[PDB]
Amino acid sequence: QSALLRTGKQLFETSCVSCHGANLQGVPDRGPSLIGTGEAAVYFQVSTGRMPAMRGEAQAPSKPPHFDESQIDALGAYVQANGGGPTVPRDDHGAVAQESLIGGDVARGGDLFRLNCASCHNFTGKGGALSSGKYAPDLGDANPAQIYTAMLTGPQNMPKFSDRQLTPDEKRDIVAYVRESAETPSYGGYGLGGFGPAPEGMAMWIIGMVAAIGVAMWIGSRA
């Protein structure tokens, strides 16, 4: 749309031309060129907030978004027009699809997640560490569109999962599994984070062992 393109350009010119140079070409050693990144990349990155980025470090951290959905769409449309590339999914009305991205199959989504996603994130989408200051973040904050677009465009040190590699049905199943694992209550008590051995051992040593030692000190006599 003409006005959408104009709004995207105006936001771009006063947000990122210092590190994604005007004309969408990347500033050498400050930011990559956005030609070909597409609307999905812009949506995911700006909505998660990573892109109003105020440091060059191991990894761009997530943060509150600096733009509302309309401005996100404007920036995405501008980048898509300039470069041309993957587009964020949308529902019948036109808004970014959230529920439509919940795949029907969850066992298949979990299998795909374990084969591809858990590699670094977790068994259930908690975070993971990477080589030098990087890390795979927890997926519990991401909404279905954000998960789908994260797969569609490998944000940073994350493999780029094309539609051919993971058909949109497979990505929808993975999104369903991610949301289900994130929103599912821990059966058996308080899941201490999602990592078994380390949080479980700390909770033993702090809750059970201090209780046992304190009870022993109560029963016995100091000497």
Binding site: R114, L115, Y187, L192, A198, A223
Partner: protein
């Protein structure tokens, strides 16, 4: 997935890397390659009967030794190397030990309820191609795993 990855790391790699007999120990434990169809039955035997039987026998020896080699005590007013100052078994020690057992099992039950331990349903079935990022053993084997991680990748290659 988690525990099978831990097995693949420790039991398989460490066993199979041992120079003179490493592969021979690996194949004899696993009945062949790593995913051999007898590993878990063998571990089940070892874990429900063999090792717990030895632990029970050694705990019996331990408690018998403590019982008949009278428990040592800290220096104190009436405490010498040739006496035991404390309380007799029947009235006080027995009751307080039983109460301590009750309280310890209460703590264990409370934690079994309120705290989630090893959500295997979250941890999918073992597949060699799948893995997570945590990949840790219980806190008692965590020091062995940490030794594996920290040791600086020193490998030696003798003649062939």
């Amino acid at each position: 997935l988690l525990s099978g990855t831990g097995i693949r790391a420790a039991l398989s790699g460490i066993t199979m890397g041992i120079p003179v007999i490493g592969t021979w120990m690996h194949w004899a434990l696993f009945g062949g390659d790593f995913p051999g169809e007898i590993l878990i039955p063998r571990l089940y035997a070892l874990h429900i009967l063999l090792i717990p039987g030895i632990i029970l026998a050694l705990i019996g020896a331990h408690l018998a030794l403590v019982w008949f080699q009278k428990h040592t005590q800290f220096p104190g007013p009436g405490r010498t190397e040739t006496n035991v100052v404390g309380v007799r078994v029947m009235p006080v020690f027995a009751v307080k030990s039983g109460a301590f057992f009750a309280m310890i099992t209460g703590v264990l039950g409370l934690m079994g309820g309120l705290l989630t331990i090893n959500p295997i349903w979250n941890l999918g079935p073992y597949k060699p191609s799948q893995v997570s990022a945590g990949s840790q053993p219980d806190f008692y084997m965590m020091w062995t795993d940490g030794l594996i991680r920290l040791w600086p990748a020193w490998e030696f290659y003798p003649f062939g």
